[PDB]
């Protein structure tokens, strides 16, 4: 790894702020067995003035179970005039838990319930952040507003297993079932629009690339595969990821070329391997010990991965 | 090893103000930008940009 | 016990003289230092392991076909045919040999010259399991080649594999290791790699049949990583590396004079400039 | 003597060839005073003070040595 | 008890793996067998971690016999390798302080002098 921060216990869950939060330093939320910390990263590739990693805690919530994902709302701002810190989590108990707070004592939760099975994924999928997507082990995609009211549910055929808006046009709701099925459903009309199959099963995490909003990255078995639409429901690369089961997709904020994968946690030491569409090998393969959760920094080449006791930096060469 | 006011060199040949572009042989320019690749290979070897300037990951 | 039909199926017995190793090695107690016998109870059984490798082996040179290895044949024996049994690649005795590798916990305490035994040992064992895979690969036909070059990735991750366990050990068996998986690209080039010896990959390329379009697609997918103009320390013989590492038409012009090229490339890099005005 | 006793304290401070050279340049002083040095001056004071010193300069070469063994890792 | 553990070594996990045997010995009291295997995995993930506190917490809560030694004695040859020389030091060796002097002293004289800073 490029850069190492030491945790205080196992990194379940990461994820970037992928908003501007109007701070000099990235933000970054990371789930650990009983808390979810927010901290502020800042590199040396941002300002000279840092030698290496600046990693500063801002806050810590007491979760109480292990938080399974993180959804950073986009209303997150840490402006000196009206500071809001605003992100959801799923956990082991099946429910959402929405934080509020102003960086200083004014700290909120609200607890959403209603999912009947473990929660796979969730995301804010509004412009204004007044709306949260998830998805399960019930079959259900469900939408939630902010006071934990159920607004909209969609039957899926299998288990949910990871959940994105799309980056430009309104109302598009993106969710891959573990079928290998991708479908996407518009929140107004609360219809599917259509869907994308994978040739691999288990489908594990797909991600929108936001540098170009025709495709579409995901991992599938042991392989990753991308479409671009609308040209084709059929992928239109399948390639190796990992030797034993991918887990986790995500495309980088910077580049549409670039995306990294993570193999299942398991007896084997955890590989993260990023990849350049123009190349038939990974560009980089890691190594993280036991790692969870996978984000890509928003303006920087580099990506974290969580593992024990550690987060995992790794910054690729362009 | 001012290397930067080396590149500067290819600015002020190709300037209108004094056409100095039109005095060069096709020799002379290929062996000035040979010279000013090897300026900016020096500038690559003290971690900046091939233009001088500040790089950022 | 009884031995008829442990020969026909005489390949159970070696999956099991290995656990019988372990539970063994359990009681070994030889986790300090001053544990020795017990050092040298695995080893008496890497030996047998590997004798009963190299006697399928030499039953291989011993062929009857007048077409596969004809050495051994009506033709001079003096010079023998490949060492691999042909072996298919067992999914057990497979295994039960990146199992023993990995009994190189062992050499962490252990005498030197023990450990060096024990060493050659299991460079001798490695060395018929990179050869049984170079013989199934090689029979392998054009058509169905979606399985053929995976296959070849999976030996490739195991020579990779081979390789970090040695990366430890010593480099004098590296050469044999590097000429047993011969026509080698992957083991020599990262060897070129992580040295300041661009004149080795230079004299690679030099002494090869299409070394050029495996280095550009092997160097290529491990650029970052070996050979890196940023891994290697490129000034001294790391930029005599960085020579033939910094292996291209914008540097065309600069050793071939291609001006119309350069004009193209620099408008094009002028075009996608929005950071530096000046630039 | 005199500067043994420099030495002395600049060791009690909070490479291992360097804390033995130390030991050695000790070793060779003490040996000449056993020879050149009289009896009557033998017998003065700085004596278990020079020892409290030595004590020092080699539990400092030891734990030096095994950090040097360890940067060599 | 034995299982969830195994799951808990797999996905290598160990401060799960040391919270659930924990829990399982309560129900599997009679179990002992078991409960020296996990052990023994906990107290290896432990070592392997550089962990060595827990490590040698590990190591006197297995049922079989001796496994408390064989902690002890890799874990030397270890801490020798990482040239963390002070912390073995300021450890004193549990119970038997003379054990693991001797044992030691047995090992290094039955070696060579070149290949250990052992003596040192």
């Known amino acids: 790894a490029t850069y190492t921060v030491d945790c205080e216990d196992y990194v379940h869950v990461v994820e970037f702020n992928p908003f501007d939060s109007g701070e000099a330093g990235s933000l970054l939320a990371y789930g650990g067995i009983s808390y979810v910390v927010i901290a502020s990263c800042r590199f040396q590739e941002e300002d000279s003035t840092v030698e290496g990693i600046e990693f500063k805690t801002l806050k810590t919530f007491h979760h109480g179970e292990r938080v399974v994902a993180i959804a950073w709302s986009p209303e997150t701002r840490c402006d000196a005039l009206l500071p809001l810190l605003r992100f959801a989590t799923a956990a082991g108990d099946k429910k959402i838990r929405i934080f509020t707070s102003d960086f200083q004592d004014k700290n909120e939760y609200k607890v959403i319930e209603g999912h009947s099975g473990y929660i796979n994924d969730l995301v804010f999928c509004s412009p204004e952040g007044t709306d949260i997507a998830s998805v399960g082990d019930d079959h259900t995609c469900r939408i939630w507003d902010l006071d934990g009211k159920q607004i909209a549910m969609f039957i899926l055929r299998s288990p949910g297993m990871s959940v994105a808006w799309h980056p430009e046009g309104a109302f598009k709701l993106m969710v891959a079932e573990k079928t290998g099925t991708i479908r996407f459903y518009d929140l107004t009309t609360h219809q599917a629009i259509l869907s994308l199959e994978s040739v691999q099963v288990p489908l594990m995490s797909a991600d929108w690339c936001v540098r170009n909003t025709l495709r579409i990255g995901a991992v599938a078995g042991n392989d990753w595969i991308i479409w671009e639409m609308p040209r084709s429901s059929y992928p239109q690369d399948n390639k190796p990821a990992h030797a034993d089961r991918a887990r986790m997709f995500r495309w980088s904020k910077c580049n549409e070329n670039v995306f990294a994968t993570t193999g299942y946690p398991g007896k084997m030491k955890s590989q993260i391997a990023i990849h350049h569409l123009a190349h038939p090998q990974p560009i980089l393969i890691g190594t993280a010990p036991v790692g969870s959760g996978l984000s890509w920094h928003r303006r920087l080449p580099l990506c974290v991965v969580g593992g024990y006791r550690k987060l995992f930096f790794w910054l690729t060469e362009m | 090893k001012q290397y930067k006011d080396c590149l500067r060199l290819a600015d002020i040949v190709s300037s209108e103000n004094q056409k100095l572009y039109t005095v060069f042989s096709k020799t002379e320019m290929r062996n000035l930008l040979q010279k000013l690749r090897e300026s900016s290979l020096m500038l690559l070897d003290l971690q900046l940009d091939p233009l001088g300037y500040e790089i950022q990951s | 016990t009884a031995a008829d039909v442990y020969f026909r199926e005489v390949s159970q017995m070696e999956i099991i003289f290995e656990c019988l190793v372990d539970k063994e090695e359990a009681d070994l107690e030889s986790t300090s230092i001053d544990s020795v016998e017990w050092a040298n109870i695995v080893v008496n059984v890497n030996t047998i392991l590997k004798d009963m490798l190299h006697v399928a082996c030499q039953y291989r040179q011993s062929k009857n076909s007048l077409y596969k290895n004809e050495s051994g044949i009506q033709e001079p024996e003096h010079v023998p045919w490949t060492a691999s049994s042909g072996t298919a690649g067992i999914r057990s005795v497979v295994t039960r040999q990146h199992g023993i590798i990995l009994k190189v916990y062992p050499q962490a305490d252990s005498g030197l010259r023990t450990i060096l035994i024990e060493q050659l040992a299991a460079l001798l064992n490695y060395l018929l399991d990179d050869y049984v895979t170079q013989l199934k690969s090689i029979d392998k036909l054009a058509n169905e080649e979606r399985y053929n070059i995976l296959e070849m990735e999976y030996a490739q991750k195991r020579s990779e594999l081979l390789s970090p366990l040695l990366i430890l050990g010593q480099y004098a068996w590296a050469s044999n290791l590097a000429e047993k998986y011969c026509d080698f690209d992957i083991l020599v080039q990262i060897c070129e790699m992580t040295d300041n010896q661009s004149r080795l990959q230079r004299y690679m390329t030099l002494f090869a049949e299409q070394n050029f379009s495996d280095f550009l697609f092997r160097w290529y997918l491990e650029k970052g990583k070996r050979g890196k103009l940023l891994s290697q320390p490129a000034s001294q013989h790391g930029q005599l590396a960085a020579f033939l590492q910094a292996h291209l038409s914008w540097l065309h012009e600069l050793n071939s004079q291609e001006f119309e090229k350069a004009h193209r490339t620099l408008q094009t890099l002028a075009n996608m400039e929005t950071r530096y005005f000046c630039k | ?73 | 008890y034995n299982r969830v553990l195994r799951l808990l070594e797999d996905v290598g996990l160990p401060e799960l793996v040391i919270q659930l045997a924990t829990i399982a010995i309560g129900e599997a009291s009679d179990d002992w067998r078991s409960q020296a295997a996990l052990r023994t995995r906990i107290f290896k993930h432990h070592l392997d971690m550089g962990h060595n506190n827990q490590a040698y917490d590990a190591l006197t809560q297995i049922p079989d016999p001796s496994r408390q030694l064989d902690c002890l004695r890799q874990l030397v040859v270890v801490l020798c390798e990482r040239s963390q020389l002070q912390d073995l030091v300021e450890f004193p060796y549990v119970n038997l302080h003379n054990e693991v002097v001797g044992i030691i002293e047995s090992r290094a004289r039955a070696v060579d002098l070149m290949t250990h800073n052992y003596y040192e």
């Not at chain 4, 600049?10 to 060839?17: C, N, P, R």
């Not at chain 4, 130390?22 to 004071?45: F, G, H, N, V, Y």
């Not at chain 4, 070469?61 to 890792?73: D, H, P, S, Y």
């Open chain 4, 1 to 73: 003597l005199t500067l043994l006793l420099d030495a002395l304290p600049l060791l009690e401070q909070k490479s291992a060839e360097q804390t033995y050279e130390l030991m050695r340049c000790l070793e060779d002083r003490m040996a000449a005073k056993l020879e050149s040095t009289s009896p009557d001056e033998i017998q003065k004071q700085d004596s278990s003070i020079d020892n409290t010193k030595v004590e020092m300069l080699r539990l400092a070469l030891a734990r030096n040595l095994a950090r040097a063994i360890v940067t060599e890792g």
